[PDB]
Design a protein around this ligand. Sequence first.
Ligand SMILES: C=C(C)c1cccc(C(C)(C)NC(=O)Nc2ccc(Cl)c(OCC(=O)O)c2)c1
Ligand SMILES: C=C(C)c1cccc(C(C)(C)NC(=O)Nc2ccc(Cl)c(OCC(=O)O)c2)c1
Ligand SMILES: C=C(C)c1cccc(C(C)(C)NC(=O)Nc2ccc(Cl)c(OCC(=O)O)c2)c1
Ligand SMILES: C=C(C)c1cccc(C(C)(C)NC(=O)Nc2ccc(Cl)c(OCC(=O)O)c2)c1
Ligand SMILES: O=c1[nH]cnc2c1ncn2[C@@H]1O[C@H](COP(=O)(O)O)[C@@H](O)[C@H]1O
Ligand SMILES: O=c1[nH]cnc2c1ncn2[C@@H]1O[C@H](COP(=O)(O)O)[C@@H](O)[C@H]1O
Ligand SMILES: O=c1[nH]cnc2c1ncn2[C@@H]1O[C@H](COP(=O)(O)O)[C@@H](O)[C@H]1O
Ligand SMILES: O=c1[nH]cnc2c1ncn2[C@@H]1O[C@H](COP(=O)(O)O)[C@@H](O)[C@H]1O
Lengths: 341, 341, 343, 343
Amino acid sequence: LKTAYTFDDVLLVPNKSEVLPNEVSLKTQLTKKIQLNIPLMSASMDTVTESKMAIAMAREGGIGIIHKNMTIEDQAREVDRVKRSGGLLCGASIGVTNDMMERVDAVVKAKVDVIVLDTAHGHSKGVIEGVKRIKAKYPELQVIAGNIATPEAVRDLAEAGADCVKVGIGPGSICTTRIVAGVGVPQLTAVMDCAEEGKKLGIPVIADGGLKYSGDIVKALAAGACAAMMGSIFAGCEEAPGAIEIYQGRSYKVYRGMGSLGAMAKKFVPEGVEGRIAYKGHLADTIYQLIGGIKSGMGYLGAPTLENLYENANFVVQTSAGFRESHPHDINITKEAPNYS
Amino acid sequence: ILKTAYTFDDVLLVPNKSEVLPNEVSLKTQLTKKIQLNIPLMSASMDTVTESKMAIAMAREGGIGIIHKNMTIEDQAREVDRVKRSGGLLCGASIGVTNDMMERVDAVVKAKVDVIVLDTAHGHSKGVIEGVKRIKAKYPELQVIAGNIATPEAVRDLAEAGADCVKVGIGPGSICTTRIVAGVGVPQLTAVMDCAEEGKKLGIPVIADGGLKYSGDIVKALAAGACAAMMGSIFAGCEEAPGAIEIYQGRSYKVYRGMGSLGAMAKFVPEGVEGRIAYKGHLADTIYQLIGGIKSGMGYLGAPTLENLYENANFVVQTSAGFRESHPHDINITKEAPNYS
Amino acid sequence: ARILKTAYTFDDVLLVPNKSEVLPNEVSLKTQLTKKIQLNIPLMSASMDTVTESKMAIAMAREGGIGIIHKNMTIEDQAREVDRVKRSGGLLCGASIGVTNDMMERVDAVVKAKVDVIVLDTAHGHSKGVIEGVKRIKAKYPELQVIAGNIATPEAVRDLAEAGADCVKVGIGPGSICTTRIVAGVGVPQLTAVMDCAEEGKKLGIPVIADGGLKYSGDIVKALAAGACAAMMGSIFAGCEEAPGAIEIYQGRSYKVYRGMGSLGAMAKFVPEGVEGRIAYKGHLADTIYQLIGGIKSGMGYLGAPTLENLYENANFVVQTSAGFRESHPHDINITKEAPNYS
Amino acid sequence: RILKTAYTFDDVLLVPNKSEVLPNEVSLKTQLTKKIQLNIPLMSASMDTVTESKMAIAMAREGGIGIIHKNMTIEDQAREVDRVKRSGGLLCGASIGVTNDMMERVDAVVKAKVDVIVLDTAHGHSKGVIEGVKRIKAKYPELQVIAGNIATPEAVRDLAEAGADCVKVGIGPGSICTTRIVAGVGVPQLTAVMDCAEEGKKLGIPVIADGGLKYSGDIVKALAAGACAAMMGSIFAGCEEAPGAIEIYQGRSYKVYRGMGSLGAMAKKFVPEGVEGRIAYKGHLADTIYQLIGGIKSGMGYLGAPTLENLYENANFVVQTSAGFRESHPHDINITKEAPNYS
Ligand SMILES: C=C(C)c1cccc(C(C)(C)NC(=O)Nc2ccc(Cl)c(OCC(=O)O)c2)c1
Ligand SMILES: C=C(C)c1cccc(C(C)(C)NC(=O)Nc2ccc(Cl)c(OCC(=O)O)c2)c1
Ligand SMILES: C=C(C)c1cccc(C(C)(C)NC(=O)Nc2ccc(Cl)c(OCC(=O)O)c2)c1
Ligand SMILES: C=C(C)c1cccc(C(C)(C)NC(=O)Nc2ccc(Cl)c(OCC(=O)O)c2)c1
Ligand SMILES: O=c1[nH]cnc2c1ncn2[C@@H]1O[C@H](COP(=O)(O)O)[C@@H](O)[C@H]1O
Ligand SMILES: O=c1[nH]cnc2c1ncn2[C@@H]1O[C@H](COP(=O)(O)O)[C@@H](O)[C@H]1O
Ligand SMILES: O=c1[nH]cnc2c1ncn2[C@@H]1O[C@H](COP(=O)(O)O)[C@@H](O)[C@H]1O
Ligand SMILES: O=c1[nH]cnc2c1ncn2[C@@H]1O[C@H](COP(=O)(O)O)[C@@H](O)[C@H]1O
């Protein structure tokens, strides 16, 4: 049995640097045809991304994926609100269902830029045939297929015609897939394995779920992922759907998995939980902290571009004792940091 | 030092290419060569888990229950008979290595029990080996499960005495202090694996008994090669289990104790503890969650049958960091999930 | 590379079951503390002033074990304590001795009091002082049984065996009240230390004592399977009524004071190597001993061992991770009744 | 792409050695360079909550050295240096950053007779630091230059070639540090020290083990790894001589402590790499040093090491697990008394 690692298992080693954090470029190719100015995407979840999130993401240089837990017409409307807010980029998740192409037609007429054929188990007959049929009707349409965790999945989805694949089985902060079904692979080893296959095929991969800190994004990108998708980092922002609740003098936002009971009900066996996270203000202040943390990581590693970061990044594995050293330790913190807990 | 040994929380199953949905998979399993179950679940023989009402309900769901032996021989026969009357359902019976062993066996077979479980603390022992041979001598066709053991040597030796099936588990029990008190045991996932591996070479099933907390654990135990999975904790809060409801801060709990605890054996030197657990309601509802979870994991792994799940399962070890990613994290869960906590 | 050996303590490992022809009540817990000194059970009470004086050493001896009277008292007082134990039936008794100018005056007085065995006990047993101490004790008192410690390496076992040690005490820093690893950065995880010292002890024919870091009876079984001839405990015995010290009330419960011999309080410009605290009152020693003995016999039955020696020759260990540890203790239950061997 | 498992201090223990020397026999003497001898191998961190003139004077009088922090006007820091230089020719240091005004800061601490500058930066393996050392050594050939912070042998070899007299190792281990969280970058501090020390020995360059030390034992491990000295902020920030307000929380008095990369420090937007907090007030620096020195002498005593060079040459390391980590700290006891060297 081989050991697989997540982000908190590894640290990136400093390289010689001639660049400073404000000198590096975060541009990335989400697909051959879609370039993003920062490597960040908001999750296609009903407590993270609707048109208001998708607009602010796009203005920051990333992209949002409008969730599909709504009627076909309303999702087309959401996409429409983004595209009419100054020609920004927009995505939209699609499902393996009988009405699948009826939903695609709608958001395609609303000029969506990318579709995410998004399922619990992406390495499947449904998703492979779905990609083919979507490409049959819309050959120009950019397709992201997921979710997967193995290089074999990258191959089979690349052959179905996906323009991009999304890596992540069970890392999500609100996910119980690993509890309920016992299936997953630790996210850093997942992205590393699939990214290396992605680059042999010329197909990019997205690191999706399990990211908590800007440093976790740096590890994902250094592992070969074109981009990072978050729910929990963005769920607490004002632009995410759902009002703020105040509890014990602090303010929180509802955040829940799309396999949770609340989400699915808009019996069954959930693969996600429903809870609340701390309110973080506007999306612009979160994005800034993440971007700054990413540029800081790339500086330590001497990388002026994302591709140079990936070709020169060395990881080391840290134990549970290294873990404690790598977070603030042996101190009573009195003031919360803007980029730490 | 032999080697490192893993339990359920140490490992994850790797997704496979899949052409089958969770609702397409079959859960049928051979408990012995003569006894098929529609689903691979067993309720433990404990005085707070399985009497006739629980073995009736387990049987209705396609499983089986083992009526505990902490009662007179007469009452145990009644309980079996109470089960068989209710539509010819399948029933099991716990026998111990005692003086009245044949007397107890005599009565449970008169009530037409389908399988007996000759189980002791240390099943790899002259007592059990000789016990099996003696039972099989007087009742050759009667199905006999022997346990508990944790080594392939034990599997081979129990097989050569005549056991129709062997039960794996020394110390994983949620109420168990054997490993604390005696320092003895094998992490349950490594034991089932090494034991199933030997057991399959001999044509003898092994049962994963003890230590199961969630449905994903059952999937791990079956991917490892168990023909079935035996639970105490998961069933012991259900309506059909014996024991009084106590209310603590407006919530309903239910007694659950080890058979080697003080209360059960009633100086003594116990090897279990005694306590309370959240009342879960009807068994059928708990079984529904566990069953959904198993079908979900088998769909993730492309396996339409348990045997195909065993042949194509790939485990990866996760660190304690992988472990924190593999549970909901960085959220205050506000709603209760039917399959998590 | 300087870092290649991983070392394990008791919670890292589990004993694998063996085929068994023995039941728990059939096993023999007898063991040779030294060639001259047999014990009926392999338990010793620590030479600490919150653990062992005459009252604790008397009670340990009646149960088949032995206590070591601590040396934080005047020479005359330690000899009275020894005499007290020895006068009450000829029970076994040990006593502690340090590397000091008056070392032999202390050894004289406990020998006049009929002590069966002395422990030349220092923080660093693998030292010129302790090596020459044994030599000088054996020259004045050749028949005197001498345990030397504490140590943690096979080289330590050999050198002290060659000084005259009849038995070697192993444990650098596993103590529940010990800060040696904290303060100095020095130690060996206790199960690997015992394994490695026992193995060298066996080649030379000198027994070794697993000293410190035992919590539950299962740990003692691992100590014995690893080769130790006997096991020494402060924490497990310190709550008992026979342990010296006051009853403090905290959160409405009764505790008894327990502290390192290297702590500030025990030593009364000090740099201590242990702390001072309280553990919950356990009642009398007979209860605690009884559960320990019950647990050791249980594990020997799981391993088919009728003697401590047979347990050592046939014990296989398996390493468990921090997730295995979680499974190896009770889990997912609000325990509602007090267990006599688990808290 | 995973190179190796890397270790920090709590991952390891030093194995005892045969010893002919007691703790009060060992020498703690060391040197930053041949020109900068220290009676003990300890330096207080250059942080605005750790080392101004008061702390440098007292560090100097205990045989260590203080690095006056640079979060102040060039004039003020030279004044602070001049203040410790006049208190009996005590040794002094001063931290310099890679800024536009950096040569005038060097000029001004040089005129004040400072003994060593620390060109201190977030990422020391950089063209900026490399060029900085060259510029400093070209104008002041005799000035002792420490350069950091770094974590790799390659960085050692580069800074050595720039002209650095001493290299400072530590990316991420700081108690107040979030670099590893926000940027994902760092190297567990024991492996970093060990690899950088070994590269520094091939080149004749000494390395300083900076950050992540919590107990006196951690320092022993760093010196045995080959560091010539150890730098600490958390351990000294609680002392009376440290700058910083006293806060009170549940019966204890605290001192403010914060990373130089936190929000408060940088305010003399921002993406911080450190946090702002508080540390238990410890009283006078003399008592903290006494416990640190005594703990270090204790560990060298255990390793049979009469000097730091002998400590480094004979130190064997062993890896403990999380289970072993729980054994290496006081366990299973309600600790009722403060220990002067353990909290
Ligand atoms: C993000 C997740 C996980 C998720 C989101 C919304 C719902 C679910 C529910 C329904 C709970 N779970 C499943 O569908 N689980 C499942 C598991 C295995 C297979 Cl092969 C499968 O194949 C159908 C498909 O791929 O749609 C499905 C889960
Ligand atoms: C499920 C467990 C663990 C259990 C259930 C009810 C009682 C016990 C008690 C009595 C506490 N414990 C033992 O019997 N323990 C033991 C230990 C070793 C041997 Cl070989 C042995 O062999 C005799 C027998 O098999 O009765 C027994 C335990
Ligand atoms: C049980 C322990 C640990 C202990 C008990 C009472 C006192 C101490 C104090 C004094 C705190 N600590 C020491 O003596 N520590 C020390 C450390 C290294 C050496 Cl080599 C040494 O060599 C003299 C000797 O071997 O006594 C001594 C500790
Ligand atoms: C000791 C730490 C951690 C630290 C101290 C004061 C400030 C900082 C702030 C500003 C938060 N962080 C940075 O400057 N971070 C950074 C990261 C990469 C590079 Cl290449 C870089 O190049 C300038 C330099 O190395 O001076 C800088 C951090
Ligand atoms: O309920 C669910 N079960 C499993 N995964 C989910 C569920 N809902 C969302 N996800 C995934 O989890 C990701 C968010 O993870 P987070 O950034 O760690 O909070 C999403 O982008 C999806 O890939
Ligand atoms: O007190 C006991 N000591 C040790 N094992 C026990 C005891 N009582 C029940 N068991 C075992 O533990 C299993 C239940 O474990 P659970 O499913 O984790 O709650 C049973 O099926 C027995 O194999
Ligand atoms: O203060 C001390 N520092 C380090 N070890 C000590 C100290 N006092 C007692 N010991 C050791 O710790 C053992 C007790 O460990 P315990 O059984 O884990 O509580 C004693 O037998 C001594 O070997
Ligand atoms: O804010 C910062 N971010 C990261 N490291 C810092 C910061 N400020 C100081 N340091 C480092 O942390 C060390 C002190 O760590 P400590 O001794 O664990 O408290 C200093 O000597 C610096 O090397």
